[PDB]
Amino acid sequence: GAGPEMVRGQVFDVGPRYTNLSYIGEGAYGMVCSAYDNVNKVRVAIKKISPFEHQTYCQRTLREIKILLRFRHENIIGINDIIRAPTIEQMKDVYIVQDLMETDLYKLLKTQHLSNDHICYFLYQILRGLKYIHSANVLHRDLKPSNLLLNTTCDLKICDFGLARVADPDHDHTGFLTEYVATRWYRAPEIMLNSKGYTKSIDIWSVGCILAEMLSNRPIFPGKHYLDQLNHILGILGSPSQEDLNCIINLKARNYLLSLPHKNKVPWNRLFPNADSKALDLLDKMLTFNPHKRIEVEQALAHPYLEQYYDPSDEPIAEAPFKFDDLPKEKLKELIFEETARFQP
Ligand SMILES: O=C(Nc1ccc2[nH]nc(-c3ccncc3)c2c1)[C@@H]1CCN(CC(=O)N2CCN(c3ccc(-c4ncccn4)cc3)CC2)C1
């Protein structure tokens, strides 16, 4: 009647509830499959995580689980179930069960032209989800096409909160060329200059990059290394203004920028000659050099480009902000145990 199913060598140890597994994808995180859920009689996504190796994997696993279990929003992927062993001793893998989707925006953009109506709907759903995330004082910190799931009718859900943080604007300042973890092409210029990425404006940048990418099917700032990223950004925005430069108090960052030859702004309408002019106005406001002047998520939702969809009464916010590293291996494993206990018999 049963006996562990397997996919591409991996044990997939999720029965008897979930059967008829089929491979979907793989990555550093581990392996995602589709599976038939014998209780809800629908196929689901299931990902196998095996993080008890180093405490960075456990950290990303804890953020993912705590954040997704607390959030409840149409444009954010949920967690439906979590499978692990009944004891901490016996627990080696964690399986996380989620709604099955058709594709993601990365896969779709590599193959498919988006109509302006698709671009607009996708952007609306991205911002609607992000409004909820930011309302909970959380930053996603790794928005990119691969982290946007789409079902067969183009409903969009933000996924992967493994790099999320609680916002902390008072502690955002740092030095020049301070190392960073989130995905290079979607990093706002201030990351390379003086920002730890602890402000909501980090995410708006990333969304801006996504919007550009939906317009041309090409990443807008495809830098090949840390500082190369800034140089792509400045190649298009042009040299920052005196005022914007004056806002960078850190001398190493400020003097770097002063060292560069003047560069002119590339007009959006020349980069995206097929784009809706309202789209390019919002793009401009999202890809603003100076993070203080960068448009916020609720202003973005109110922008004329999104007028067909905007309805703040149907753009919900979180009930309460989050306020949940210095924690040993053993304690991180215990917390993953405790957090997943609600799904055990
Ligand atoms: O949520 C995720 N995937 C996902 C979910 C639901 C879905 N429904 N439908 C789909 C779908 C259907 C068809 N085509 C494409 C997609 C789908 C995909 C991804 C997989 C992983 N997840 C992040 C996550 O689970 N985190 C916790 C674990 N973290 C982690 C843990 C261990 C390692 C690691 N690395 C190296 C060695 C060992 N462990 C790395 C990251 C990363 C964040 C984002």
281 flagged as catalytic: no
Burial of 335 (0-12, 13-18, 19+ CB in 10 A): middle
Burial class of residue 214 (count of CB atoms within 10 Å of its CB; 0-12, 13-18, 19+):
buried
Whole-angstrom distance, CA of residue 310 vs CA of residue 124: 8
Domains and CATH numbers, the chain: 1-100+326-345 (3.30.200.20), 101-325 (1.10.510.10)
Q: What is the DSSP string of 33-74?
A: EEEEETTTTEEEEEEEE--TTSHHHHHHHHHHHHHHHH---T
Residue with tokens 């999202």: 286
**Ligand 1, atom nearest to 98 Cα:** 6
Residues with CB under 6 A from ligand 1: 24-25, 28-29, 32, 45, 47, 49-51, 53, 57, 60-61, 64, 77, 96, 98-101, 103-104, 149, 159-160, 162
- Tell me how far apart the terminal alpha carbons of the chain are, to the nearest angstrom: 20
Residues in contact with 140: Cβ distance below 8 Å, sequence separation at least 6, in sequence order: 130, 133, 147, 158, 161, 163, 164, 203, 206
Residue nearest to atom 15 of ligand 1 (CA): 103
Q: Taking the mean position of all CA atoms in its chain, how far away is CA 133? A: 11
Catalytic member of 142, 160, 203, 244: 142
Q: Output DSSP code: residue 51.
A: -
What residues does 149 pair with on adjacent strands?
104, 157
Q: Ligand 1 mean position to 108 CA, how many Å?
A: 18
Deposited resolution, Å: 1.9
Asked whether the beta carbons of 203 and 140 are under 8 A apart, the reply is yes
